[PDB]
Amino acid sequence: AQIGPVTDLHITNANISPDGFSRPAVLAGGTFPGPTIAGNTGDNFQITVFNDLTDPSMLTDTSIHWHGLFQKGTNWADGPAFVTQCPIITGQSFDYNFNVPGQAGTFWYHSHLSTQYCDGLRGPFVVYDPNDPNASLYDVDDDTTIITLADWYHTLAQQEPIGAAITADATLINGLGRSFTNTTASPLSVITVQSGKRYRMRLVSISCDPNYLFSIDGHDMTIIEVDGVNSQQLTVDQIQIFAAQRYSFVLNANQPVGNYWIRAQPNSGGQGFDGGINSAILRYEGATVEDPTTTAPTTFSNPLVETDLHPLADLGVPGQPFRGGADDPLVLNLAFANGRFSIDGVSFVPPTVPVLLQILSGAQNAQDLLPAGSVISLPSNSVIEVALPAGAAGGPHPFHLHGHNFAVVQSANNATPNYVNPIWRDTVSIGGTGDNVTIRFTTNNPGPWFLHCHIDWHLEAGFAIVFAEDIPDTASANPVPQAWSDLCPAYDQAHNIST
Numbered sequence: 311a312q313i314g315p316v317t318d319l320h321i322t323n324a325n326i327s328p329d330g331f332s333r334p335a336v337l338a339g340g341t342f343p344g345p346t347i348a349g350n351t352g353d354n355f356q357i358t359v360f361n362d363l364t365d366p367s368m369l370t371d372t373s374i375h376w377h378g379l380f381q382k383g384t385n386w387a388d389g390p391a392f393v394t395q396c397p398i399i400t401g402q403s404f405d406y407n408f409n410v411p412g413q414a415g416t417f418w419y420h421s422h423l424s425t426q427y428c429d430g431l432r433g434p435f436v437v438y439d440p441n442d443p444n445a446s447l448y449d450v451d452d453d454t455t456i457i458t459l460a461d462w463y464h465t466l467a468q469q470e471p472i473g474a475a476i477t478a479d480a481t482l483i484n485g486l487g488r489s490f491t492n493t494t495a496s497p498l499s500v501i502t503v504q505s506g507k508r509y510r511m512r513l514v515s516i517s518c519d520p521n522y523l524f525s526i527d528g529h530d531m532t533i534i535e536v537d538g539v540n541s542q543q544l545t546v547d548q549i550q551i552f553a554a555q556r557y558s559f560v561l562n563a564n565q566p567v568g569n570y571w572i573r574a575q576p577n578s579g580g581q582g583f584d585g586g587i588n589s590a591i592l593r594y595e596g597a598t599v600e601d602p603t604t605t606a607p608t609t610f611s612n613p614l615v616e617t618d619l620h621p622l623a624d625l626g627v628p629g630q631p632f633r634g635g636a637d638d639p640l641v642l643n644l645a646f647a648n649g650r651f652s653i654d655g656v657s658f659v660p661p662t663v664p665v666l667l668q669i670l671s672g673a674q675n676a677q678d679l680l681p682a683g684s685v686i687s688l689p690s691n692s693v694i695e696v697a698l699p700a701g702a703a704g705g706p707h708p709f710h711l712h713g714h715n716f717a718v719v720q721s722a723n724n725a726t727p728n729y730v731n732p733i734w735r736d737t738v739s740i741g742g743t744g745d746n747v748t749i750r751f752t753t754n755n756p757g758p759w760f761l762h763c764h765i766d767w768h769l770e771a772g773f774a775i776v777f778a779e780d781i782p783d784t785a786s787a788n789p790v791p792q793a794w795s796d797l798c799p800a801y802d803q804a805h806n807i808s809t
């Protein structure tokens with residue numbers, strides 16, 4: 311069952327064995343992935359998060375981010391530790407009380423403390439639209455049509471060297487999959503369809519690192535949503551999905567009744583499908599209960615290419631149709647050396663006082679804010695352009711901006727910008743050497759918004775900056791509840807920190 315929009319959510323430690331290997335984890339709702347949180351567009355969500363964690367090897371503090379939800383007027387509820395809050399300590403709870411005006415689509419939630427979401431705190435978050443313009447394109451859209459793609463590690467996250475190339479031990483599809491080494495024939499996930507029906511498959515990358523080449527043997531996929539943004543219909547036979555991205559696609563159950571492999575090939579870790587790694591099963595009602603015998607093609611003839619995507623609505627692009635054609639045009643210098651990432655010459659290390667609390671206490675320019683050199687102010691009611699030229703080791707890096715979606719004016723592997731009708735999204739691959747992936751948005755949401763690579767190991771190694779958007783209006787726009795004001799005193803007391 312789905313939970314929400316008003317619900318408790320308990321965060322616990324437990325042993326799980328999603329690939330046949332038992333390890334302890336950090337779980338929401340007792341499962342991996344966590345339960346789906348859901349509601350309708352414009353609803354009030356009140357997710358009371360109970361921190362019941364006791365195992366220090368995965369951190370007993372926590373904080374949860376609602377990925378892709380804009381949090382307008384509720385920056386304090388966004389979740390990134392030391393940007394918008396101090397962590398919740400064990401034995402305490404916190405009500406994330408916010409609204410989702412003007413958004414409908416496929417989202418997710420995850421820990422946003424250190425690398426803790428890798429240890430298991432990740433689940434889907436769906437905001438349905440009762441008047442969805444795409445409703446007539448499918449018959450079925452429910453908890454059974456959500457497909458999560460996850461990397462899973464046998465080593466606990468707090469034992470991963472910072473700045474290292476860290477590699478997973480299994481791909482999990484809907485929480486199940488097989489290990490790359492010492493492979494055992496543990497259970498595979500089954501997605502069940504009825505011949506003749508059309509399904510809104512909600513594909514969610516809950517990855518901490520790899521991108522996946524996703525396909526379904528014998529089937530194609532008609533994209534209708536990208537990171538929350540309705541798209542024109544685009545039919546493809548493969549989707550390369552980077553960490554934290556989402557797509558809705560229509561699956562037409564139009565092939566013979568049978569069993570078909572669902573494939574998710576990561577860019578690192580196990581390559582191929584030997585022993586049923588990187589796999590799940592599409593089963594038609596009436597098919598025999600047995601593994602598929604289908605083949606992938608050698609090459610995919612209609613792969614997703616990001617510049618082929620266009621919004622369903624006339625979203626356009628803000629600003630002027632050339633590089634630098636914005637009120638505030640920025641170019642970030644994105645680098646890696648010696649185990650640490652940097653942006654504009656500064657490696658991100660979380661501050662002691664959350665950025666939002668520094669601003670509410672009266673710090674009102676970006677040079678007064680800590681960490682020094684990690685906070686860039688943005689002016690209000692202005693068109694922002696951010697060029698993100700690739701080259702830093704460990705790519706391709708999927709950059710994500712909180713508080714906003716953005717027009718993708720230039721995509722990976724294509725030097726031509728689009729100032730007319732690019733897709734809008736919230737997490738974008740910045741590509742390869744020589745690329746110049748560029749995003750645009752307008753500043754109508756006061757508060758400090760994190761910008762970072764969504765490979766969680768890279769964020770931990772410093773690949774982040776904070777956009778302090780409209781510092782002068784942050785306090786009036788974001789009134790804070792007493793429970794939020796209580797978080798830093800409690801956290802600092804528990805950890806013997808003075809501030």
Ligand SMILES: *[C@@H]1O[C@H](CO)[C@@H](O[C@@H]2O[C@H](CO)[C@@H](O)[C@H](O)[C@H]2NC(C)=O)[C@H](O)[C@H]1NC(C)=O
Binds near residue numbers: 641699744745746748
């Ligand atoms: C990516 O595009 C940005 C512009 O959006 C380029 O920025 C210019 O960089 C040159 C120096 O390299 C400066 O003289 C300009 O002031 C910058 N802004 C402009 C021209 O609008 C950046 O060089 C591009 N990077 C790559 C790798 O192609």
Ligand SMILES: *[C@@H]1O[C@H](CO)[C@@H](O[C@@H]2O[C@H](CO)[C@@H](O)[C@H](O)[C@H]2NC(C)=O)[C@H](O)[C@H]1NC(C)=O
Binds near residue numbers: 617
């Ligand atoms: C590279 O990106 C450009 C810009 O998004 C793509 O160019 C568009 O191509 C479409 C489809 O043919 C045309 O309708 C548009 O007028 C083009 N826009 C511009 C600004 O040129 C281009 O197709 C992409 N290249 C590849 C190989 O997909």
Ligand SMILES: [Cu+2]
Binds near residue numbers: 375377710764
């Ligand atoms: Cu996220």
Ligand SMILES: [Cu+2]
Binds near residue numbers: 375376377712713
């Ligand atoms: Cu986010």
Ligand SMILES: [Cu+2]
Binds near residue numbers: 705707764765768
């Ligand atoms: Cu990265």
Ligand SMILES: [Cu+2]
Binds near residue numbers: 375390710
């Ligand atoms: Cu973030």
Ligand code: NA
Binds near residue numbers: 626627628629
């Ligand atoms: Na425009």
